[PDB]
Amino acid sequence: ANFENFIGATEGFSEIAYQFTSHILTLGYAVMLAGLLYFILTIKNVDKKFQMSNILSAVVMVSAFLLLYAQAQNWTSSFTFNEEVGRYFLDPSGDLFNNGYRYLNWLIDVPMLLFQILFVVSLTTSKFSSVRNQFWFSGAMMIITGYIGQFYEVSNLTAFLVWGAISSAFFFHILWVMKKVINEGKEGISPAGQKILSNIWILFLISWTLYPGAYLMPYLTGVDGFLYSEDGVMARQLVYTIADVSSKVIYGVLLGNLAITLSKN
Ligand SMILES: *C\C=C(C)/C=C/C=C(C)/C=C/C1=C(C)CCCC1(C)C
Ligand code: NA
């Protein structure tokens, strides 16, 4: 199926690769639940006109609590321990570890994380509906092609790469539209909130770039590399989780901070 299974069918997992990964995937959904409550309880702090931003952060949290919990469980129950070999192996009776919970969680989240900036910041010469439609089309295709190429990670790898770049194309378009949005958004706000908008843009830049980094993480050292192992698996799943907290939780926090800062009139 995927590289995670491959490693759990051929070489198996050491007990520390398996516990680490399970522990990191549990942290991912725990944060989402703490985030959900933070966004709900803080909506009283921001003027009515920016509250749609909190509402959207809260629904992204419900989406990511549930599906990152599904994902966590699909990792634990897909592997059983072999006491004779001392490593964890793909359980033929279990479900087989799957990526479809994460990619679905991206597909749902992506219109919402992009739409929500447009409820805090104002455009100048760009058209709102123009920006919205560009966000929703390319963020869907970025993820849908990302999911397709994900099927060919273990099998045909040039399909894994031709697709991963197709999805890069949509990715870079979003970065372009986000960049115009943040610029027009800086016009006619205080220097304080401009600073936050600049933060939001650096965060939006790093946190989203981690995602294709974790896509290639095992092949990043070549087809016979130090990461071609239960190591680039650990690191792939450590990087997704970092990119999940940053792009969903931290991002929504800086937006709520920006909103509050724009209620200094
Ligand atoms: C959790 C919410 C969001 C919006 C997640 C976004 C993820 C990405 C931007 C991932 C992009 C990919 C790229 C650029 C190429 C390989 C396939 C990925 C889906 C990992
Ligand atoms: Na996720």
Coordinates of C-alpha atoms and ligand atoms in Angstrom, one line a residue:
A1 CA 0.0 0.0 0.0
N2 CA 2.0 2.9 1.4
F3 CA 5.5 3.2 2.8
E4 CA 4.4 2.7 6.4
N5 CA 2.9 -0.7 5.6
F6 CA 5.9 -1.8 3.4
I7 CA 8.1 -1.1 6.4
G8 CA 5.6 -2.9 8.7
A9 CA 5.4 -5.9 6.3
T10 CA 9.1 -6.2 5.3
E11 CA 11.4 -5.1 8.1
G12 CA 8.8 -4.3 10.9
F13 CA 9.0 -1.6 13.6
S14 CA 11.2 -1.3 16.6
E15 CA 9.2 -0.8 19.8
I16 CA 10.5 2.8 20.0
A17 CA 9.4 3.7 16.5
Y18 CA 6.0 2.3 17.2
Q19 CA 5.5 3.9 20.6
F20 CA 6.9 7.2 19.4
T21 CA 4.6 7.4 16.4
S22 CA 1.6 6.4 18.4
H23 CA 2.5 8.9 21.1
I24 CA 3.0 11.7 18.6
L25 CA -0.3 10.9 16.8
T26 CA -2.0 11.1 20.2
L27 CA -0.5 14.5 20.9
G28 CA -1.9 15.6 17.6
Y29 CA -5.6 15.0 18.5
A30 CA -5.2 16.1 22.1
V31 CA -4.1 19.6 21.0
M32 CA -7.1 19.8 18.6
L33 CA -9.4 19.3 21.6
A34 CA -7.6 21.9 23.7
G35 CA -7.7 24.2 20.7
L36 CA -11.5 23.7 20.2
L37 CA -12.1 24.9 23.7
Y38 CA -9.7 27.8 23.4
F39 CA -11.5 29.1 20.3
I40 CA -15.0 28.7 21.8
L41 CA -14.1 30.3 25.1
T42 CA -12.3 33.2 23.5
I43 CA -15.0 34.3 21.1
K44 CA -16.3 36.7 23.7
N45 CA -13.0 38.7 23.3
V46 CA -13.4 39.7 19.7
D47 CA -15.9 42.1 18.2
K48 CA -18.9 40.5 16.4
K49 CA -17.4 41.5 13.1
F50 CA -14.4 39.2 13.4
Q51 CA -16.1 36.4 15.3
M52 CA -16.6 34.4 12.0
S53 CA -12.8 33.7 12.3
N54 CA -13.2 32.1 15.7
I55 CA -16.2 30.1 14.5
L56 CA -14.1 28.7 11.6
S57 CA -11.1 27.8 13.8
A58 CA -13.6 25.9 16.1
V59 CA -15.0 23.8 13.2
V60 CA -11.5 23.0 11.9
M61 CA -10.8 21.8 15.4
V62 CA -13.8 19.5 15.4
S63 CA -12.7 18.2 12.0
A64 CA -9.1 17.6 13.2
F65 CA -10.0 16.2 16.6
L66 CA -12.2 13.5 15.1
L67 CA -10.1 12.5 12.1
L68 CA -6.7 12.7 13.8
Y69 CA -8.2 10.5 16.4
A70 CA -9.3 8.0 13.7
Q71 CA -5.8 8.3 12.3
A72 CA -4.2 7.6 15.7
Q73 CA -6.2 4.5 16.1
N74 CA -5.5 3.3 12.6
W75 CA -1.8 3.3 13.5
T76 CA -2.0 1.4 16.8
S77 CA -4.3 -1.4 15.6
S78 CA -2.7 -1.9 12.3
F79 CA 0.5 -3.4 13.9
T80 CA 0.9 -6.3 16.3
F81 CA 4.1 -7.3 18.2
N82 CA 6.1 -10.4 17.2
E83 CA 7.7 -11.6 20.5
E84 CA 9.9 -14.0 18.4
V85 CA 11.4 -11.2 16.4
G86 CA 11.0 -8.3 18.9
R87 CA 9.5 -5.9 16.3
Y88 CA 6.0 -4.8 15.4
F89 CA 4.6 -6.2 12.1
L90 CA 1.6 -5.4 9.9
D91 CA -1.3 -7.5 11.2
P92 CA -3.0 -9.3 8.3
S93 CA -6.2 -9.5 10.3
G94 CA -6.2 -5.8 11.2
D95 CA -7.1 -2.9 8.9
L96 CA -3.7 -1.9 7.3
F97 CA -2.5 1.6 8.2
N98 CA -4.1 4.2 6.0
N99 CA -3.5 7.9 5.1
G100 CA -7.1 8.6 4.1
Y101 CA -8.0 10.1 7.4
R102 CA -5.3 12.8 7.2
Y103 CA -6.0 13.7 3.6
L104 CA -9.7 13.9 4.2
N105 CA -9.0 16.2 7.2
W106 CA -6.9 18.4 4.9
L107 CA -9.7 18.5 2.3
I108 CA -12.3 19.7 4.8
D109 CA -10.0 22.1 6.6
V110 CA -8.4 23.7 3.5
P111 CA -11.3 26.0 2.4
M112 CA -11.8 27.0 6.0
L113 CA -8.2 28.0 6.9
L114 CA -8.0 30.1 3.7
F115 CA -11.4 31.7 3.9
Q116 CA -11.0 32.9 7.4
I117 CA -8.2 35.5 6.8
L118 CA -10.8 37.3 4.7
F119 CA -12.9 37.8 7.9
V120 CA -10.2 39.6 9.8
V121 CA -8.3 41.5 7.0
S122 CA -9.8 43.8 4.4
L123 CA -9.0 43.7 0.7
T124 CA -8.2 46.9 -1.3
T125 CA -8.2 46.4 -5.1
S126 CA -8.8 42.6 -5.1
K127 CA -12.4 41.3 -5.2
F128 CA -13.5 39.2 -2.2
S129 CA -15.4 36.6 -4.3
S130 CA -12.5 36.5 -6.7
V131 CA -10.0 35.7 -3.9
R132 CA -12.4 33.1 -2.3
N133 CA -12.9 31.1 -5.5
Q134 CA -9.2 31.0 -6.2
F135 CA -8.6 29.7 -2.7
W136 CA -11.3 27.0 -2.8
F137 CA -10.4 25.7 -6.3
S138 CA -6.6 25.3 -6.0
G139 CA -6.7 24.1 -2.3
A140 CA -9.1 21.3 -3.3
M141 CA -6.9 20.3 -6.3
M142 CA -3.7 20.6 -4.3
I143 CA -5.1 18.0 -1.9
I144 CA -6.9 15.8 -4.4
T145 CA -3.7 15.3 -6.5
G146 CA -1.7 15.0 -3.3
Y147 CA -3.9 12.1 -2.4
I148 CA -3.6 10.4 -5.8
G149 CA 0.2 10.5 -5.8
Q150 CA 0.1 9.2 -2.3
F151 CA -1.2 5.9 -3.7
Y152 CA 2.0 5.4 -5.8
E153 CA 4.4 6.0 -2.9
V154 CA 5.5 2.3 -2.7
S155 CA 4.6 1.3 -6.2
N156 CA 5.4 3.6 -9.2
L157 CA 7.5 6.4 -7.8
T158 CA 7.7 8.7 -10.8
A159 CA 3.9 8.8 -10.5
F160 CA 4.5 9.7 -6.8
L161 CA 6.6 12.6 -8.0
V162 CA 4.9 13.8 -11.1
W163 CA 1.7 14.0 -9.0
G164 CA 3.5 15.6 -6.0
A165 CA 4.6 18.4 -8.2
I166 CA 1.2 18.8 -9.8
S167 CA 0.0 19.4 -6.3
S168 CA 2.9 21.7 -5.8
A169 CA 1.6 23.8 -8.7
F170 CA -1.7 24.4 -6.9
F171 CA 0.2 24.9 -3.6
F172 CA 2.3 27.8 -5.1
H173 CA -0.8 29.5 -6.6
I174 CA -2.3 29.6 -3.1
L175 CA 0.9 31.2 -1.8
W176 CA 0.6 33.8 -4.5
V177 CA -3.0 34.7 -3.7
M178 CA -2.2 34.6 0.1
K179 CA 0.6 37.0 -0.6
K180 CA -1.7 39.5 -2.4
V181 CA -4.2 39.2 0.4
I182 CA -1.7 39.9 3.2
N183 CA -0.4 43.0 1.3
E184 CA -3.8 44.7 0.7
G185 CA -4.6 43.6 4.3
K186 CA -1.7 45.6 5.6
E187 CA -3.0 48.9 4.1
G188 CA -4.7 51.0 6.7
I189 CA -4.2 49.0 9.8
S190 CA -1.9 50.0 12.7
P191 CA 1.8 49.1 12.7
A192 CA 0.9 46.7 15.6
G193 CA -1.4 44.5 13.5
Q194 CA 0.8 44.8 10.4
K195 CA 3.4 43.1 12.6
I196 CA 1.0 40.2 13.4
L197 CA 0.0 39.9 9.7
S198 CA 3.7 39.5 8.9
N199 CA 4.0 36.8 11.5
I200 CA 0.9 35.1 10.1
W201 CA 2.6 35.1 6.7
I202 CA 5.8 33.6 7.9
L203 CA 3.9 30.9 9.8
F204 CA 1.6 30.3 6.8
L205 CA 4.9 29.9 4.8
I206 CA 6.8 27.5 7.0
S207 CA 3.9 25.4 8.4
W208 CA 2.4 24.6 4.9
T209 CA 5.8 23.9 3.4
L210 CA 6.4 21.2 6.1
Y211 CA 3.6 19.2 4.5
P212 CA 5.4 18.3 1.2
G213 CA 8.6 17.9 3.2
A214 CA 6.9 15.1 5.1
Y215 CA 5.5 13.7 1.8
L216 CA 9.0 12.9 0.5
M217 CA 10.7 12.5 3.9
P218 CA 11.7 8.8 3.3
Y219 CA 13.0 9.4 -0.2
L220 CA 14.8 12.6 0.8
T221 CA 18.0 10.6 1.3
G222 CA 17.6 8.6 -1.9
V223 CA 16.0 5.2 -2.5
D224 CA 18.6 3.5 -0.2
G225 CA 19.1 6.1 2.5
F226 CA 19.2 6.5 6.2
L227 CA 15.6 7.7 6.1
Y228 CA 14.5 4.7 3.9
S229 CA 13.4 3.0 7.0
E230 CA 11.3 3.2 10.2
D231 CA 13.2 6.6 10.7
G232 CA 11.8 8.6 7.9
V233 CA 8.5 7.1 9.0
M234 CA 9.0 8.5 12.5
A235 CA 10.1 11.8 11.1
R236 CA 7.3 12.0 8.5
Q237 CA 4.7 11.5 11.2
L238 CA 6.5 13.9 13.5
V239 CA 6.5 16.6 10.8
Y240 CA 2.8 16.2 9.8
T241 CA 1.8 16.7 13.5
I242 CA 4.0 19.8 13.8
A243 CA 2.5 21.1 10.6
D244 CA -1.0 20.3 12.0
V245 CA -0.6 22.3 15.2
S246 CA 1.0 25.2 13.4
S247 CA -1.3 25.5 10.4
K248 CA -4.6 24.9 12.3
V249 CA -4.1 25.9 15.9
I250 CA -1.3 28.5 16.0
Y251 CA -2.6 30.0 12.8
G252 CA -6.0 30.5 14.3
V253 CA -4.5 31.9 17.4
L254 CA -2.5 34.6 15.6
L255 CA -5.7 35.5 13.7
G256 CA -7.6 35.9 16.9
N257 CA -4.8 38.1 18.2
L258 CA -5.0 40.1 15.1
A259 CA -8.8 40.5 15.4
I260 CA -8.4 41.7 19.1
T261 CA -5.7 44.1 17.9
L262 CA -8.0 45.6 15.3
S263 CA -10.5 46.3 18.1
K264 CA -8.1 49.0 19.4
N265 CA -10.0 51.9 17.8
Ligands
LIG1 C1 -4.5 20.7 7.8 C2 -4.8 21.7 6.9 C3 -4.2 22.0 5.7 C4 -4.7 23.1 4.8 C5 -3.2 21.1 5.2 C6 -2.4 21.4 4.1 C7 -1.4 20.6 3.5 C8 -0.7 20.9 2.4 C9 -0.6 22.3 1.9 C10 0.0 19.8 1.7 C11 0.5 19.9 0.5 C12 1.1 18.8 -0.3 C13 2.0 19.2 -1.2 C14 2.5 20.6 -1.5 C15 2.7 18.2 -2.2 C16 2.6 16.8 -1.7 C17 1.2 16.4 -1.2 C18 0.8 17.3 0.0 C19 -0.7 17.2 0.2 C20 1.5 16.9 1.3
NA2 NA -4.2 16.7 9.9

